[PDB]
Design a protein around this ligand. Structure first.
Ligand SMILES: Nc1nc2c(ncn2[C@@H]2O[C@H](COP(=O)(O)OP(=O)(O)OP(=O)(O)O)[C@@H](O)[C@H]2O)c(=O)[nH]1
Ligand SMILES: [Mg+2]
Lengths: 415, 13, 181, 165
């Protein structure tokens, strides 16, 4: 139950505005930025600011604030999921969404803010379906806009029939200062890129633990998907029945499912770091990075960030493998390894100075956070088994998959 | 992405 | 400064009035008091071009609160557009109807909304179901007197569930405004 | 490529003959609270016609078009004697401006299917169209359901818009 979808800039003036109910005055956004700067200096910052009877649900984009005002008891999660879907629709029409895109494309953005939401209710937000009658380059609305299958326009014909899948892992990790693992979970996301012709009814098959326990294959390697968040397209009642993934895919890239499970396996890249921070003199980083995973796999282009003090000076970097650049913007060293094979153990020694006059304020201790990437490897052990293309016409498509292991928030705390 | 795919079976009969 | 804009706006060429209204809602975007130029964009509204009418409906929606007496010259155009064979322009006119917050206008708009609730093409129905809630926001007893709620409950028992979803949303909007009688 | 108005008291058959010149039909039309504008391409001149209704709340909203106004057509109500007096009063209130000063006048005796409707001479004497200075006026009897007298009025209008062959 939004009232007025505003789009601001970093100065607080209105890039574009679109009210629906009129319960919030159009000059109420002038009280957003002073209230945000007031709440900023007392630590009571919130995504829901308050000006009397006008609440400001807002998110922060690159240079943009998408304030969505409201007056009554608005459904808040509706408003925020609406705002991030508006961000996704604008970033699918526009290659980037900045201040230079609003004031140069106001022909289509008022049309979109009239089309996506009426009276405060989202009604049609699939951007690929929305490309068919709201163009920047008008016909009748397609039947896909009204029909139950509202994410796939019938009549799309390709030359080939390629089904691309990206079972991309993302290891989250949080190792404390003692050297023990606090939280280690994997947020994986199967990301498809569908090039199919017709109205296919795919049936994706996984090695789910519940499906194998109800099948009778309960001694092979099966992933215990602790939670799965499918897309809109997946028939969720049939998935709750017998763990079956049946859907009609959209046209283009999308995120099908987002599984999330825990990990009692060792961390992939371990960062055994020690810090000899002598006061007023210098600091030594005799850090090493061993790879606990298999010997075969090859971690491409990892970036092991290690936070340094704010005012370090005259760096020296005695490494073994992989160069060191020193980024004083983020105030951390970026120990970039180009190729990091499994089973190895690379040592690196950084050595700064430190000013002899002491600091005025505190410093804070951000974690060591790597940016690794391992192809052809799944930490979860999920294995897609099949993908039955079902089409009334009848053809053979080529389903392709690749497995990538990335990081999420792969943080390791310091002392 | 410079990574290459692997084809999956269709039916898993 | 605005007089050349009005003179180019009261022309007869397509490329003149089109660039005129684009300049108008460009000045509306930056926050200029363009409210005084209201009854001159209303004359150049009835066009077959559809990329232009969205801008004029935008101007009628952002500036009917400030000019309440001047906005009486639009009702015939909306009840003309709510019979066009293009369903997009019908639903565009319908979602433009309810957002015009003038009490003197809603008494004439009850008939084409009543017709568009009984339309066949479900896009304008899922627009008009929310437009019923838009109209109930303005005058609650007017919608009860016109008896839209008993027609609105009949779209809940309809197929093609998007009209069902918007009708349930509008009914939950209206039943929140009632004292639960 | 000329603009032209259609004003007068409401329920006078003016949007009927507008859409009769547009398509050639007798359509079901509500009492026009707003306004209608169409064009009729005829004798190489696009007649951009601007009908405005004649309800009580929309009569003072005629001055918002009178900036850059080129022509005029007034349509009488021959069958309502109790309202033709205030129709003449609304006309003389409209004719009391120095802003609309260049426009030609063209009166249509409309709804000529009832025997009570007057001819093309008595309406002039009731309105007093002779005492209107700088008004190149002309009267015409028009029947709305048949469509007679419409092309003659458009032809006299074409003789008034251009002053050449
Ligand atoms: N019997 C008869 N009735 C007519 C004739 N012409 C018009 N009428 C009636 O007069 C009414 C007015 O006609 P319209 O042109 O549709 O309406 P209008 O003159 O534009 O009046 P407003 O819409 O209020 O501005 C119509 O609804 C008809 O019922 C006619 O030639 N014969
Ligand atoms: Mg009329």
């Amino acid at each position: 139950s939004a009232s007025a979808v505003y789009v601001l800039d970093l100065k607080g003036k209105v890039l574009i505005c679109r009210n629906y109910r009129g319960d919030v005055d159009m000059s109420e956004v002038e009280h957003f930025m002073p209230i945000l700067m007031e709440k900023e200096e007392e630590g009571m910052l919130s995504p829901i600011l308050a000006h009397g009877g006008v609440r400001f649900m807002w998110i922060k984009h690159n240079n943009l604030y998408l304030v969505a005002t409201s007056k009554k008891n608005a459904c808040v999660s509706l408003v925020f999921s609406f705002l991030y879907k508006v961000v996704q629709v604008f970033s699918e029409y526009f290659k980037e969404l900045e201040e230079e895109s609003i004031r140069d494309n106001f022909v289509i953005i008022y049309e979109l803010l009239d089309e996506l939401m009426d009276f405060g209710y989202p009604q049609t937000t699939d951007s690929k379906i929305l490309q068919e009658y709201i163009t920047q380059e008008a016909p009748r609305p397609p039947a896909t806009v009204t029909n139950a299958v509202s994410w796939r326009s019938e009549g799309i014909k390709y030359r080939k029939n390629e089904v691309f899948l990206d079972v991309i892992e993302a290891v989250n990790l949080l190792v404390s200062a003692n050297g023990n693992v606090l939280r280690s979970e994997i947020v994986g996301s199967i990301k498809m890129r569908v090039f199919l012709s017709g109205m296919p009814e795919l049936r994706l098959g996984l090695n789910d633990k519940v499906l194998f326990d109800n099948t009778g294959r309960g001694k092979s390697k099966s992933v215990e998907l602790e939670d799965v968040k499918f897309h809109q397209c997946v028939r969720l009642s049939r998935f709750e029945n017998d763990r079956t993934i049946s859907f009609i895919p959209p046209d283009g890239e999308f995120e099908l499912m987002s599984y999330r499970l825990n990990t009692h396996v060792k961390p992939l890249i371990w960062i055994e770091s020690v810090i000899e921070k002598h006061s007023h003199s210098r600091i030594e980083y005799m850090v090493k990075a061993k790879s606990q995973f298999k010997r075969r796999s090859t971690a491409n282009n990892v970036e092991i960030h290690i936070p340094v003090p704010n005012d370090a000076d005259s760096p020296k970097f005695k490494t073994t493998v992989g160069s060191v650049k020193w980024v004083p913007e983020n105030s951390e060293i970026v120990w970039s390894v180009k190729s990091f094979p499994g089973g190895k153990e690379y040592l690196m020694r950084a050595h700064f100075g430190l000013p002899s006059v002491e600091a005025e304020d505190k410093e804070g201790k951000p974690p060591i956070s790597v940016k690794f990437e391992i192809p052809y490897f799944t930490t979860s052990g999920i294995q897609v088994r099949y993908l039955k293309i079902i089409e009334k016409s009848g053809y053979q498509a080529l389903p392709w998959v690749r497995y990538i292991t990335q990081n999420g928030d792969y943080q390791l705390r310091t002392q | 992405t410079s990574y290459d795919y692997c084809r999956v079976p269709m039916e898993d009969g | 400064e605005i007089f050349e804009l009005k003179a180019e706006l009261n022309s007869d060429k397509k490329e003149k009035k089109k660039e005129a209204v684009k300049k108008v809602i460009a000045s509306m975007t930056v926050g200029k008091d363009v409210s005084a130029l209201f009854p001159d964009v209303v004359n150049c509204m009835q066009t077959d071009n559809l990329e232009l009418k969205k801008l004029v409906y935008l101007y009628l929606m952002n500036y009917a609160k400030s000019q309440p007496d001047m906005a009486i010259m639009a009702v015939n155009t909306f009840v003309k557009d709510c019979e066009d064979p293009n369903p997009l322009i019908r639903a565009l006119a319908v979602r433009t109807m309810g957002c015009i917050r003038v009490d003197k206008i809603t008494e004439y708009l009850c008939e084409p909304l009543r017709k568009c609730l009984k339309d066949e093409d479900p896009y304008v129905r899922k627009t008009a179901a929310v437009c019923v809630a838009k109209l109930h926001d303005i005058n609650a007893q007017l919608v009860e007197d016109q008896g839209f709620l008993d027609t609105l409950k009949d779209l809940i028992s309809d197929s093609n569930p998007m009209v069902v979803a918007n009708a349930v949303a509008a009914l939950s909007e209206i039943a929140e405004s009632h004292p639960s009688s | 490529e000329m603009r032209i108005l259609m004003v007068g008291l409401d329920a006078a058959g003016k949007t009927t003959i507008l859409y009769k010149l547009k398509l050639g039909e007798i359509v079901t039309t509500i009492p026009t609270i707003g306004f209608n504008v169409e064009t009729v391409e005829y004798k190489n001149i696009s007649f951009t016609v601007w009908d405005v209704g004649g309800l009580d709340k929309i009569r003072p909203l005629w001055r918002h078009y009178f900036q850059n106004t080129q022509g005029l057509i007034f349509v009488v109500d021959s069958n309502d004697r109790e309202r033709v007096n205030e129709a003449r009063e609304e006309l003389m209130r409209m004719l009391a401006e120095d802003e609309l000063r260049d426009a030609v006048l063209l009166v249509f005796a409309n709804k000529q299917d009832l025997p009570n409707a007057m001819n093309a001479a008595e309406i002039t004497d009731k309105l007093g169209l002779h005492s209107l200075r700088h008004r190149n006026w002309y009267i015409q009897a028009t029947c709305a359901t048949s469509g007679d007298g419409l092309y003659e009025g458009l032809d006299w209008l074409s003789n008034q818009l251009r002053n050449q062959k």
